Amino acid sequence: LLAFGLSFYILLNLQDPFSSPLLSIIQTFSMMLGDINYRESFLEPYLRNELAHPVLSFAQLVSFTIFVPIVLMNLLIGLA
Amino acid sequence: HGMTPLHLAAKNGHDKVVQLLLKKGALFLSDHNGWTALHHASMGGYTQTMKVILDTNLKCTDRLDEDGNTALHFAAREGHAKAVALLLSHNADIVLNKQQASFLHLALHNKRKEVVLTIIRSKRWDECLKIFSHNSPGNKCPITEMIEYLPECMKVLLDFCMLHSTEDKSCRDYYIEYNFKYLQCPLEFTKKTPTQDVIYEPLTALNAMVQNNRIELLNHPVCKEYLLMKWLAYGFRAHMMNLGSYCLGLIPMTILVVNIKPGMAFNSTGIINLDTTNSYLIKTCMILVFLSSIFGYCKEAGQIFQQKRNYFMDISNVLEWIIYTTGIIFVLPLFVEIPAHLQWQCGAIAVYFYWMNFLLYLQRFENCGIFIVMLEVILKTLLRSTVVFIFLLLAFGLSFYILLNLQDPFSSPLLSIIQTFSMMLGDINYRESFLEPYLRNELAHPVLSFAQLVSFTIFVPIVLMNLLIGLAVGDIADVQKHASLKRIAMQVELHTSLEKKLPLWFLRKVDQKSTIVYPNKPSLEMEILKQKYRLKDLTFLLEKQHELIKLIIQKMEIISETE
Amino acid sequence: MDISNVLEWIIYTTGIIFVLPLFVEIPAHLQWQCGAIAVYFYWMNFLLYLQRFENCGIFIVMLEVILKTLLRSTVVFIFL
Amino acid sequence: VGDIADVQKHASLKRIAMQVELHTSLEKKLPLWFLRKVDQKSTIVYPNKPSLEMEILKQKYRLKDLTFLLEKQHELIKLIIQKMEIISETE
Ligand SMILES: *[C]C(=O)[N][C]C1=[C][C]=C2[C]C3=C([C])[C]=C([C])N3[B](F)(F)N12
Ligand SMILES: [Ca+2]
Ligand SMILES: [Ca+2]
């Protein structure tokens, strides 16, 4: 959550879910279950040219979705 | 076969008639294969026959057969513990055969548990420990076969190292001294030297333990104290400079991120936007990240000097190379100004990859390091099935690009795949994407779009995601099956790789080889293989018994029953 | 008695109807309707052609056995 | 989870059996003259120039002949008492 939360704080800084570092981590903790919004946070900012780093934001989106809801949550299932 | 009557009497172990032949004179000749009577009496374990033989002249106790085995070799190979105790009470010499095996090697290869306990518990144990020879593929160092073949007798050997030298339990003067004389070479054979032809890699007994899966030996209190000695000697110190030099750039990066707004650039004098508030904190974190990055260059350039062409077969090294350049470009306004867009672009890469790589630095722990091994094995089998993800996202993404083309989530092909990748977890919208377009007659192909929706929902969030779950359950299961051995083997491989590159004079200084601890002052297949050997000699005895009974009928008085 | 052969028969006709304006014109609605079927089923069937490999072919066997036991319980889904 | 477990239990054999069944079905339809051309039947490789139930069944057979030997041994000892000189111990 410090890796993804601080990177999302830099990339998606203009959006209200990622405004302080301590709101970026809670939102990244909320996206842990698979509740990545991607439309109000990634797609519609990108189509309005509101993403500062567009190619990094989608790369961080894909690497988040692979790691935390897929890989990390399947690790907790297989542990349980 | 050249056997004299002294050989035949001692082979079947008749001590009274073997006393009679020596009362007349038998000269202790050697038959074909060169065995004397003591070779026959030992192979059979007739200690009472061996006793009367060994009280005549002692000229026969050190003879050699055609392979050079002495009498102790035969008594230890066939597993006669009272025979080797008798043959060691008398000072019979310990030698090697033509295959460079001592009598300890033959007992370890034939798994004679009661014999090697009598070797350990008796005297002359050190002199048969050092009697082995190097440059031999079989019959190595006697400790290493004791790990390899008879781990329960190694546990008895480790009990002799754990001494108390007291009897007042839970006393202030009570102590337990642990000795590590059997766990290690004297470290001159660890480094490559022209005078030291032996190349024994360090922590020899523990590296043999993790290779031969001896988890019960690794949890021994001598081996736990031995690792804790190696930890406090150099293991904790070398881990603290490695983690400490990394946190010298990790922590000033995070301070620099959360204290500057991620839009605009910043000099060392402060934020440009010009703020110049708390500019001392921004300057030193800019300086500390720059010096820790160029320390990481010399750390990586020192790694390619020690590891040539096997450095590049490691994926963690390319993570460090991203980390140290993008650290510098984040703080390049120390010297030369750069655009604010480039500075924070490299800042987002650096602060993301710092904490991802700091996850790798706690793999060298025990309480949380097993989850990084679980994280790596799940990630490895997800990248092994990545082409199935590519072809599923190309199937569904390009079809959704055709069907739902009028909607902004599916406008380019490269935004259709990312949205299909986002719908993978079960975040199919279906209302703003499928239902409300259908009720507004905005779906071009309505019946295909709902058919693609149902076939997507079956395949990717249900079937494909349950495949990754069931892959991860099996992958965690065999990691947790070997988890207790994995954390100890990671600690052993840490210290083995550490003192392989440490200088020898430093290793002489920090090693202490015996620690004193004051306590109160401050499982089934092995049972079958034991039973198979207990049956293999049983049928060997019965066949030997059967020829005796065949001999009885062959030589028997029959007058009354002659038909 | 093979289900993969009917996937190929969908693939080759709908390929032709996608590119039938080589010879005879067709409505645009029909052309892209068969285009969506063809490009979906091409990559689904290309998943079957890597079953004859070793490094990734075991996941197609895992995908087939999970899919077979989901279609064996399909009536429980219908009634629920 | 159960369906992946018994696939991974036979996974190492499955990939080899898929390769064998590939080549078996391939050269079943290939012509024989072509198979004579491409087969070479001996390859030279230059290396440096460029588990428990079987133990029980082994032990059962090692016990089945042991009781066969003991029964053969028992009739010999029965023969010894059958043909033996007894004068001093005739009650
Ligand atoms: C056996 C093992 O492993 N370790 C031990 C060893 C090795 C090598 C060696 C050598 C020697 C000498 C010369 C002396 C002695 C005592 N040693 B040892 F330590 F046994 N080693
Ligand atoms: Ca490295
Ligand atoms: Ca076919």
Integer Cα distance of C49 and B11 in angstroms: 71
Contacts of B385 in chain C (CB under 8 A): 56, 59
The number of beta carbons lying within 10 Å of the beta carbon of residue D35 is: 11
Q: Which residues pair with B179 in a beta bridge?
A: B514
Query: B229: Cβ–Cβ under 8 A, 6 or more apart, which residues?
Result: B180, B512, B515
Q: How far apart are CA B450 and CA B299, in angstroms?
A: 57
By CB neighbour count within 10 A (0-12 exposed, 13-18 middle, 19+ buried), where does C61 fall? middle
Residue B122 near residue B85 (C-beta atoms within 8 A): yes
Q: Is B322 helix (H, G, I), strand (E, B) or coil?
A: helix
The torsion angles phi and psi of B303, rounded to 5 degrees, stand at: -80, -35
**Contacts of residue B427, Cβ cutoff 8 Å, sequence gap at least 6:** A34, A35, A36, A38
How far is Cα B532 from Cα C73, in angstroms, rounded to an integer?
48
Q: Tell me how far the alpha carbon of residue B299 lies from the centroid of ligand 2, in angstroms.
A: 8
CA–CA distances in Å: residue B235 to residues B155, B215, B229, B231, C69: 25, 21, 9, 4, 52
D81 touches chain B (CB under 8 A): no
State the Cα–Cα distance between residues B166 and D56, nearest whole angstrom: 48
Please indicate whether, in this complex, the C-beta atoms of C47 and B388 are within 8 angstroms of each other.
yes
Cβ-contact C36, C14 below 8 angstroms: no
Nearest to B98 by CA among B106, B107, B90: B106
What is the Cα–Cα distance from D40 to D42, expressed in whole angstroms? 6
Is residue B284 within 8 A of residue B374, CB to CB? The reply is no
Q: What is the gyration radius of the CA atoms in chain B, in angstroms? A: 37
Query: B317 a known binding residue?
Result: yes
> Tokens 């995601």 — which residue?
B465
Query: DSSP label at C16?
Result: H
3-state secondary structure B155-194: HHHHHHHEECCCCCCCCCCCCEEEECCCCCCCCCCCCCCC
- Amino acid present at B418: I
Both tokens of B28, joined, read 């202790």
- Left (φ > 0), alpha (ψ -120 to 50) or beta: where does B141 sit? beta
Q: Which residues contact B20 (CB under 8 A, 6 or more apart)?
A: none
Return the bridge partners of B178, or none: B162, B515
Q: Which two tokens stand for residue B314?
A: 């490691």
Cβ atoms within 10 Å of B498's Cβ, excluding its own: 20
Q: How far apart are CA B282 and CA B267, in angstroms?
A: 9
- CB within 8 Å: C63 and B448: no
* Residue length of chain C: 80
Cβ contacts of D3 on chain B, cutoff 8 Å: 470
d(CA B155, CA B218): 10
What residues pair up with B514 in beta bridges, in sequence order? B179
Which two structure tokens, joined as six digits, stand for B119?
């070797």
- The tokens for B489 are 């083997």
Q: Which residue has the tokens 């001896």?
A: B214
Cα B293 to Cα B286: distance, rounded to the nearest angstrom: 11
Identify the closest residue of chain B to A4 by CA–CA distance. B352
Nearest CA to ligand 1 atom 4: B185
Q: Which residue has the tokens 């002949």?
A: D65
Amino acid (one-letter) located at B61: T
Inspect the interface and report whether the beta carbons of C36 and B394 lie closer than 8 Å. no
Secondary structure class of C74 (helix, strand, coil): helix
Structure tokens at A42: 């990634």
Q: Which has the closest alpha carbon to B187: B514, B488, B503?
A: B503
C46, C40, C78: which is closest to B445 by C-alpha?
C40
B548 touches chain D (CB under 8 A): no
Under a CB-based contact definition with an 8 Å cutoff, are residues B65 and B39 in contact? yes
Nearest CA in chain B to D87: B560
Instruction: For residues D4 and C64, give the distance between their C-alpha atoms in angstroms, rounded to a whole number.
Output: 11
Q: Does D84 touch chain B (CB under 8 A)?
A: yes
Polymer length in residues for chain B: 563
- Would strands B162-163 and B176-179 be described as parallel, antiparallel, or unpaired? antiparallel
Give the closest residue (by CA) to ligand 1 atom 8. Answer: B185
Give residue B420's Cα distance to chain centre. Answer: 43
Centroid of ligand 3 to alpha carbon of C31 (angstroms): 25
First and final C-alpha spacing in chain B: 39
Residue linked to tokens 């279906």: B430
Between helices B483-501 and B221-230, what is the axis angle to 10°? 40
Exposure b/e, B70-89, CB count within 10 A at least 16 = b: bbbbbbbbbbbbbbbbbbbe
Instruction: From B169, B136, B141, select the one nearest B154 (Cα to Cα).
Output: B141
Cβ atoms < 10 Å from Cβ of C48: 14
* DSSP symbols for B193-234: -SS------SSHHHHHHHHTT-HHHHTSHHHHHHHHHHIIII
* Residue A51: burial class (beta carbons within 10 Å; 0-12, 13-18, 19+): buried
Sign for the pseudo-dihedral over CA of A36, A41, A44, A47: negative
Dist CA B430 CA B95 (whole Å) = 83
Under DSSP, is residue B383 helix (H, G, I), strand (E, B) or coil? Answer: helix
Residue B158 contacts residue B195 (beta carbons within 8 Å): no
Does the beta carbon of C66 lie under 8 angstroms from any beta carbon of chain D? yes
Cα-Cα-Cα-Cα dihedral sign, residues B356, B362, B363, B366:
negative
Q: Say how many Å lie between the CA of residue B187 and the centre of ligand 1.
A: 9
Provide the 10 A C-beta neighbour count for residue D40.
7
- The chain C residue lying nearest D19, using CA atoms, is C52
Q: Measuring from atom 11 of ligand 1, which residue has the nearest CA?
A: B130
Helices (H) and strands (E) counted in chain A, each on its own, are: 5, 0
Contact C45, C11 (CB under 8 A): yes
CB contact under 8 A, B395 and C40: yes
Euclidean distance between CA atoms B455 and B446, whole angstroms? 14
**What distance in angstroms lies between residue C21's CA and the mean position of ligand 3's atoms?**
27
- Distance in angstroms (rounded) separating the CA atoms of residues B127 and B288: 58
Mutate to test the interface with B, among D81, D84, D87 (most CBs of B within 10 A): D84
CA angle, corner B458, sides to B457 and B460, nearest 5?
70
d(CA A13, CA A23): 11
Residue A38 half-sphere exposure toward CB, CA atoms < 13 A: 28
Q: Tell me if residue B366 falls in helix, strand or coil.
A: coil
User: What whole-number distance in Å separates Cα of residue B70 and Cα of residue B97?
Assistant: 8
**Cα B515 to Cα B221: distance, rounded to the nearest angstrom:** 12
Q: Binding site annotation covers B161?
A: yes
Mark whether C and A touch (3+ CB pairs within 8 Å).
no
Residue B270's identity, in one-letter code, is G
CA distance B69 to D87: 50
Cβ count near B515 (within 10 Å): 16
Cα of B130 vs centre of ligand 1, distance in Å, is: 6
CA of B488: how far to CAs of B199, B206, B364, B492, D60, in Å? 23, 9, 11, 6, 39
By CA distance, what is B456's nearest residue in C? C40
Q: Which of B531, B532, B549 sits opposite D76 (nearest CB)?
A: B549
The position carrying tokens 């055709």 is: B402
Q: Which two tokens stand for residue B358?
A: 């700091």
C1 to chain B, closest Cα gap in Å: 23
| Cβ neighbours of residue B514 closer than 8 Å, sequence gap 6 or more | B177, B178, B179, B180, B181
Rounded Cα distance, C51 and C76, in Å: 30
In contact, A73 and A33? CB cutoff 8 Å: yes
CA within 13 Å, CB half, B479: 20
Residue C70 contacts D where some CB pair is shorter than 8 Å: no
Point out the residue among C52, C65, C69 whose CB comes nearest to the CB of D18.
C52
Task: Pick the closest to residue B22 from B50, B63, B62, B1 (CA basis).
Answer: B50
Q: If you ran DSSP here, which 8-state letter would residue C49 be given?
A: H
| B111 Cβ contact list (under 8 Å, min separation 6) | B149, B150, B533
Instruction: State the residue for tokens 């293999």.
Output: B536
Task: Give the technique used to solve this structure.
Answer: cryo-EM
Chains touching chain D through at least 3 C-beta pairs below 8 angstroms are B, C
Place of tokens 């490094």: C55
Report CA dihedral (A47, A53, A55, A59) to the nearest 10 degrees.
Answer: -110
Counting every residue written for chain A, the total comes to 80
Strands B514-517 and B176-179: antiparallel
Helices and strands (H, E) in chain B, number of each type:
27, 5
- Cross-strand pairs, B266: B271
DSSP class of B31: -
Residue B181 dihedral angles phi and psi, to the nearest 5°: -75, -20
**Nearest CB to B561; choose among D3, D76, D82:** D82
Q: What angle do CA D24, D28, D34 make, to 5 degrees?
A: 110
Residues A20-48, buried b or exposed e (16+ Cβ, 10 A)?
A: ebeebbebbeebbebebbbbebbbebbee
DSSP secondary structure of B263-317: SS-EETTEE-----SSHHHHHHHHHHHHHHHHHHHHHHHHHHHHSSSSSTT-SHH
The answer to whether D1 contacts B473, with C-beta atoms less than 8 Å apart, is yes
* Residue A57 · residue A12 · CB < 8 Å: yes
Residue B169 near residue B131, CB atoms below 8 Å: no
Any idea which residue has 């079809």 for tokens? B399
Q: Taken in order B187, B191, B197, B200, is the CA torsion positive or negative?
A: positive
Q: Name chain C contacts of B392, Cβ cutoff 8 Å.
A: 43, 47
The CA distance from B181 to B184, in Å, is 7
Pairing assessment for the beta strands B514-517 and B270-271 based on DSSP bridges: unpaired
Beta bridge partners of B441: none
Using a 10 angstrom Cβ sphere, with 0-12 exposed, 13-18 middle and 19 or more buried, the burial of residue B405 is middle
Q: Taking chain A, what is the end-to-end CA distance rounded to the nearest angstrom?
A: 21
- Answer yes or no: are the C-beta atoms of B133 and B100 closer than 8 Å: yes
Query: What is the token pair recorded at B369?
Result: 């390091």
Q: Identify which of B206, B164, B150 has the alpha carbon closest to the alpha carbon of residue B490.
A: B206
Measured distance CA(A35)–CA(A69) in Å, rounded: 9
- Start-to-end CA span in chain D (Å): 78
3-state secondary structure of B451: helix
- Residues recorded for chain D: 91
- What's the per-residue H, E or C state across B488-549? HHHHHHHHHHHHHHCCHHHHHHHCCCEEEECCCCCCCHHHHHHHHHHHHHHHHHHHHHHHHH
Radius of gyration of chain D (CA): 31
On whether any CB of chain B is under 8 Å from the CB of C65, the answer is no
Question: What's chain C's Rg over C-alpha atoms?
Answer: 17
Chain D neighbors of C51, CB-CB under 8 A: 18
Please, are residues B477 and C68 in contact by the beta-carbon 8 Å criterion? no
**DSSP line for B90-132:** TT------TT---HHHHHHHTT-HHHHHHHHHSSSHHHHHTT-
CA atoms within 13 A on the CB side of B238: 19
**CA B274 → CA B67, B252, B257, distances in Å?**
91, 22, 18
Distances (CA, A) of B130 to B47, B121, B125, B181, C79: 27, 16, 9, 12, 77
Q: For chain D, give me the number of helices (H) and strands (E)?
A: 4, 0
Residue D64 is inside which H or E element, if any?
Answer: helix D53-82
To the nearest 10 degrees (0 to 180), the angle between helices B236-259 and B340-361 is 150
What 3-state DSSP class applies to D1? coil
In the sheet that holds B514-517, the strands lie side by side as: B162-163, B176-179, B514-517
Residue nearest atom 15 in ligand 1 by C-alpha distance: B130
User: B417-449: b or e for each residue (b if 16 or more CB lie within 10 Å)?
Assistant: bbbbbbbbbebbbeeebbeebeeeeebbbeebb
CA of B84 to the centre of ligand 1 (A): 24
First to last CA, chain C: 30
Nearest to B212 by CA among B152, B162, B157: B152
Resolution in A for the shown PDB structure?
Answer: 2.6
Q: Is the Cα torsion angle B351, B352, B354, B358 positive or negative in sign?
A: positive
SS3 D40: coil
